[PDB]
Structures are given as C-alpha cells and as structure tokens.
Design a protein around this ligand. Structure first.
Ligand SMILES: Nc1nc2c(c(=O)[nH]1)N1CN2[C@@H]2O[C@H](COP(=O)(O)OP(=O)(O)OC[C@H]3O[C@@H]1[C@H](O)[C@@H]3O)[C@@H](O)[C@H]2O
Length: 252
C-alpha cells in the first residue's frame, strides 16, 4: 500500500510476544515483582487500546495496567531526563545510584515500542499509528507515556534529579514531557529540591549553561511551586561516567 491511514510508524513487529517476554524477564530479575502474572499484565495492556479508536484513548484506559504494575521505587533516588535518555540509563546501570522509569516494570515493558489498534476490530495496526503532531495527541503511545510519567513524578521525594541536553536550542523545553507533565506533578509537600544536571555536547571548555534563559525559566517555575532549584554543568559526560565507575581516578 502506497498510502497509510496515519502519519506515524505502525506497531512494533511482534508487539504481543515482546511485551510478554519483557514482563517474564523483568519479573525474573526483580524480586519485588516476582509474583506479577504476566498474562494478566498483557491482557490489561491490550485492553487499554484494542478495539478502541486510536485518537480516543484516555488515562482511564490504562488504569487496569497501572494497577497491575503498581511498584514502589526509592522516592529519594528518582532520575528524570529530557532528550538525553541514553546517558541516564548508562549512569544508573553502573551501581543503581538512581532510578528511571525503565527500572520499573511499566517503563521497561514499553520502552522504544510503538502500538495502536483500530475502532471496532480487535486487530493491532502494524501499518501506521497516529502521529502526536499531525494526527492526534490522545493516541495509545502518547497517552501511556503521559500517564506513567506523571505517576513517576508524583512518587518522588527529597532531592529529585533531572538530566537535560545542553546541546538543544531549548535546554529546558516547556513542551517536553518533563516540562509539561513532570515539573507540575512533583509534590511540594515531599520534594525538597529539583537538581538539574545540564549535559554539555560541544567542544571542551564552554559556557555556564546553568545561566541559560530556559534554565532560569525552569528555576522560576519550580521555585514558585515551593520547591528549591539547584543546577550543575556536566561539561564532559565521558569523564563523568568514568568517575562514576572509578571514583578514585585522580582526574575525578
Ligand atoms: N522510554 C521512555 N520514554 C519516555 C519516558 C521514559 O521514562 N521512558 N518519559 C517520557 N518519554 C517519552 O519519550 C519521548 C522522548 O522524550 P524526550 O523528548 O527526550 O524528553 P521528554 O521530557 O518529553 O520525556 C522524558 C521524561 O518523561 C518520561 C521520563 O521519566 C523523563 O523524565 C517522548 O514522547 C516522551 O513522552
């Protein structure tokens, strides 16, 4: 076919088998989830979007899945990020200093996948799925990430960290999930401080990106929520990871 229904990529090939297998793997490794029934998880996940119009998805659709995937993460060790997922993952994998959504069953199941169905058939659409921008915002993937991302921010306490991509024209982007959902769902009763680590992408010696107008904007928003804001430059992320791995290194 030379023209698809929607503008976005279709469902990831073998989506059902992949989600099920990820659930088996995650629950084998993480003892706190060792009792989860992975068939039930898949059934709830499918139930969120199968036979539903893929521009008419709501947070309620995912509630059965959210309930089954209920999981505590150490509230004071949460790492959020925007446009720099790979460094976040590389850092937490060293010694589990912090936790991202992929450390949770639900984030692990969905990471890097795309999915959608069709109104009034029970088929998965492997050909195309709605684009957030061109087609609709209330699509299966966008709604999933909005819901689980809000819930993760709500779980945080004490000091919460965020890695930001300092090579972007908007280092803090109010339109990102971090900026539009997570910033507004940190609970001021519980969260003392948001600390941003601004990750440099460029040459070597460079600017203090903690003075960037978008970072001043983030500071202003967070501060007006009665949460303290702190920011640090990470000038050389390669050195940073080396120091996390081997902190006795003289150059650290
Ligand atoms: N696999 C994951 N994806 C996402 C997570 C997440 O935790 N894992 N997300 C979001 N997300 C989706 O991935 C793209 C790119 O985000 P990208 O544009 O790079 O950054 P965002 O700030 O939109 O989203 C990152 C922020 O929300 C959670 C995670 O806890 C981070 O603190 C965009 O559609 C997001 O909604």
């Amino acid at each position: 076919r030379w023209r698809q229904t929607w503008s976005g990529p279709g469902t990831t090939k073998r989506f059902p088998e992949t989600v099920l297998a990820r659930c088996v793997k995650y629950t084998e490794i993480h003892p706190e989830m060792r009792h989860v029934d992975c068939q039930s998880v898949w059934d709830a996940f499918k139930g969120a979007f199968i036979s539903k119009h893929p521009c008419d998805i709501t947070e309620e659709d995912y509630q059965p899945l959210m309930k089954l995937g209920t999981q505590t993460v150490p509230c004071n060790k949460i790492l959020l990020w925007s446009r720099i997922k790979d460094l976040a993952h590389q850092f937490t994998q060293v010694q589990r200093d912090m936790f991202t959504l992929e450390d949770t069953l639900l984030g692990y199941l969905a990471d890097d996948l795309t999915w959608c169905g069709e109104f009034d058939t029970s088929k998965i659409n492997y050909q195309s799925c709605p684009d957030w921008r061109k087609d609709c915002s209330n699509n299966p993937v966008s709604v999933f990430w909005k819901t689980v991302s809000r819930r993760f921010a709500e779980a945080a306490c004490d000091v919460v960290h965020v890695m930001l991509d300092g090579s972007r024209s908007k280092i803090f982007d109010k339109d990102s999930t971090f900026g539009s959902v997570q910033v507004h769902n940190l609970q001021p009763e519980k969260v003392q401080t948001l600390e941003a680590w601004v990750i440099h992408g460029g040459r070597e010696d460079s600017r203090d990106l903690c003075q960037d107008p978008t970072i001043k904007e983030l500071e202003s928003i967070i501060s007006k929520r009665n949460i303290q804001f702190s920011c640090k430059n990470i000038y050389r992320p390669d050195k940073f990871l080396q120091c996390v791995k081997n902190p006795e290194d003289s150059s650290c």
